[PDB]
Amino acid sequence: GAMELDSMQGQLKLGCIPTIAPFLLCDLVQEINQRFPQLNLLLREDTTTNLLTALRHGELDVLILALPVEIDGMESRVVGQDPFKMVISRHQAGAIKVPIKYDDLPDESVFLLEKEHCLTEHAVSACKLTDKEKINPFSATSLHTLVQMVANGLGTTFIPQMAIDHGLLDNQNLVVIEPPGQQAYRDIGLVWRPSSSRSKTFNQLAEVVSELL
């Protein structure tokens, strides 16, 4: 018979936005499988506002977000920075000169995600895109289909470095360019409820995530 028998044990419900989740969480899972093998991560992917509601309502324990976004009343910790690049099709790379000058781009040549995705506000502000006439009026609804439109030669867009590092551009014959701006990156952060009893778990997770960025 046998005798019947800690922060990083057990189950955690973690939410993450669509422009992060496919990239960073692959690396996070591989690290915690080894370093914290009793931690089971139930994962939810949703856009920022929906994730915040789920966190406040106790449907999720912790979020991995891009910051800043509205997180009144929550506790957060910034864990690293994720650079922005621009991308254009190799077959349009000639007809667009580098360094990129937005005034030199055609009108309606910049494609962006619908505004429920925080990537659009982060990129437009961090890369100083102030001329709204360069933005195409057709809004993209996923990072993958945004990139596919650029690969079809339709214009250009801003892409986070973690997507590039995880192969998002593979086999799509794209060129990666630096945007304008001295602070062309987004912060990445973990967000949780102040009344949680699991802050030690979240801060240990925070340290793991920071090492992936």
Please tell me whether residue 93 binds a copy of itself under the rule CB under 8 A: no
Q: In the bound complex, what is the minimum distance in angstroms from residue 192's beta carbon to Cl ion?
A: 17
Q: In whole angstroms, give the CA distance from residue 92 to residue 59.
A: 45
Q: In the bound complex, what is the minimum distance in angstroms from residue 100's beta carbon to Cl ion?
A: 25
**What residue 32 binds from a copy of itself, Cl ion, none (CB within 5 to 8 A, per partner kind)?**
a copy of itself
Judged by CB under 8 A, the residue of 22, 80, 83, 181 near a copy of itself is 22
**What residue 66 binds from Cl ion, a copy of itself, none (CB within 5 to 8 A, per partner kind)?**
none
**What residue 10 binds from Cl ion, a copy of itself, none (CB within 5 to 8 A, per partner kind)?**
none
Judged by CB under 8 A, the residue of 9, 10, 33, 98 near a copy of itself is 33
Task: CB nearer to Cl ion: give 8 or 213.
Answer: 213
Please tell me whether residue 53 binds a copy of itself under the rule CB under 8 A: no
Residues 143 to 182: which contact a copy of itself by CB under 8 A?
144-145, 148-149, 151-154, 167, 170-173
Q: In whole angstroms, give the CA distance from residue 141 to residue 147.
A: 11
Q: In the bound complex, what is the minimum distance in angstroms from residue 197's beta carbon to a copy of itself?
A: 21
- Written in H, E and C, the secondary structure of the chain is CCCCCCCCCEEEEEEECCCCHHHHHHHHHHHHHHHCCCEEEEEEECCHHHHHHHHHCCCCCEEEEEECCCCCCCEEEEEEEEEEEEEEEHHHCCCCCCCCCHHHCCCCCECCECCCCHHHHHHHHHCCCCCHHHECCCCECCHHHHHHHHHCCCCEEEEEHHHHHCCCCCCCCEEEECCCCCCCEEEEEEEECCCCCCHHHHHHHHHHHHHCC
Applying CB under 8 A, the residues found at the interface with a copy of itself are 13, 16, 18, 21-22, 25-26, 29-30, 32-33, 40-46, 89, 91, 138, 140-142, 144-145, 148-149, 151-154, 167, 170-173
